[PDB]
């Protein structure tokens, strides 16, 4: 993990983690609050990316492409892992706790359930730790398939560096679990599918014009 230290990736994760006081300070439209949280987190996502080894060394236009291509999955991965701390629902970065009943009444119960079943429950069952989550997110970030990349080979090289470090980390931290590395990578297709379905919901909310959408989220939703 010399060129891609897991210690640095963990550091990046901890650096943008919502504070305990934010949750304490609190405990009405569910979708509006969720979208507000997403906008807030888009700013911290940029901060997080800059802390991932070598991301800032990529040409600016490629940094832009990678973040536009992966913000949806990157944010879902983040709040999903954050939510293993509660028995049900999801904890928003704004401190609010959204329960299943609220999601269903709001009309987004199916995708909310997919997140809880395919991501949250699986992360909690295997006790995915923050270092592992951080590496999976970095892998998602370094997506060499993103169209428009000036140097996709370098992004591909960076991704390979991350999964090499992640495998070494898993082998050392959990020697008793040989298939843990594969198990982690195999949550990525589910994350991809869920991210695509979430985007479909966001475009609908935007199209209706009923939901307040802040500046950064709006920019991410508007074509290049």
């Amino acid at each position: 993990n010399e060129d891609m230290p897991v210690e640095r990736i963990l550091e990046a994760e901890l650096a943008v983690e919502p504070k305990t006081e934010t949750y304490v300070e609190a405990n009405n439209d569910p979708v509006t609050n969720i979208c507000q949280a997403a906008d807030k987190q888009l700013f911290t996502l940029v901060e997080w990316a800059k802390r991932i080894p070598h991301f800032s060394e990529l040409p600016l236009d490629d940094q832009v492409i990678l973040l536009r291509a992966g913000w949806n999955e990157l944010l879902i991965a983040s709040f999903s892992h954050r939510s293993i701390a509660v028995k049900d629902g999801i904890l928003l970065a704004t401190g609010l706790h959204v329960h299943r009943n609220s999601a269903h009444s709001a009309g987004v119960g199916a995708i909310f359930d997919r997140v809880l079943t395919e991501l949250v429950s699986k992360m909690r069952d295997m006790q995915m730790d923050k270092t592992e989550l951080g590496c999976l997110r970095a892998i998602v970030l370094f997506n060499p398939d993103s169209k428009g990349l000036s140097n996709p080979a370098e992004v591909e090289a960076l991704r390979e560096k991350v999964y090499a470090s992640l495998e070494a980390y898993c082998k050392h931290k959990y020697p008793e679990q040989p298939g843990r590395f594969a198990k982690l990578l195999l949550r990525l297709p589910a994350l991809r599918s869920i991210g695509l379905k979430c985007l479909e919901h966001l475009f609908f909310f935007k199209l209706i014009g009923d939901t307040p959408i802040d500046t950064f989220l709006m920019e991410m939703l508007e074509a290049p």
């Binding site: 700013f43 940029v46 800059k50 600016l60 940094q63 832009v64 973040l67 536009r68 500046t215 950064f216 920019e219 991410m220 290049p224």
Partner: peptide, 11 residues
């Protein structure tokens, strides 16, 4: 052209 994102990355 992704005004906000560019400003945040360059900053």
């Amino acid at each position: 052209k992704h005004k906000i994102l560019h400003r945040l990355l360059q900053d």
